[PDB]
């Protein structure tokens, strides 16, 4: 004997979300980065004014973990993409705000063109 009701929304913006993005033109407004010995892919950037933007969901600094419905979590830079050139127009990004990792993208390292 048990039951259970609905659930209100609370906060901490930490764990992995669904950010449903409608392809405008360009993309989902949004960058991805990664694809080394699977250590995860993390979003690089947000267009301003795109669906990863307006949605008001996607942000820079996030870690991508799948698209649509695709496991990326150990996919390489090529294929968190090609899952997305396999997408649609509502495509979602289930994305984790994980700023604690994205850091090693954000201090970069050096490249000499």
């Known amino acids: ?17 669904k950010i449903i993005l409608h392809k405008g033109s360009t ?23 795109g669906p990863a933007d307006l949605s008001g969901e996607l942000r820079r600094g996030d870690r991508i973990l ?6 990326l ?14 997408a649609g127009q509502s495509v979602t990004i289930v994305a984790q705000y994980r700023p604690e990792e994205y850091s090693r993208f954000e201090s970069s390292g050096p490249s000499s063109g």
Do not use: M
Not at 1 to 17: F, H, M, Q
């Open 1 to 17: 004997g048990s039951s259970g009701s609905s659930g209100r929304p609370g906060g901490d913006a930490r764990e992995p979300r």
């Open 27 to 49: 993309g989902l407004g949004f960058n991805i980065v990664g694809g080394e010995d699977g250590e995860g892919i993390f979003v690089s950037f947000i267009l301003a004014g």
């Open 66 to 71: 799948s698209v649509n419905g695709v496991n």
């Open 73 to 86: 979590r150990n996919a390489t830079h090529e294929q968190a993409a090609a899952a997305l050139k396999r």
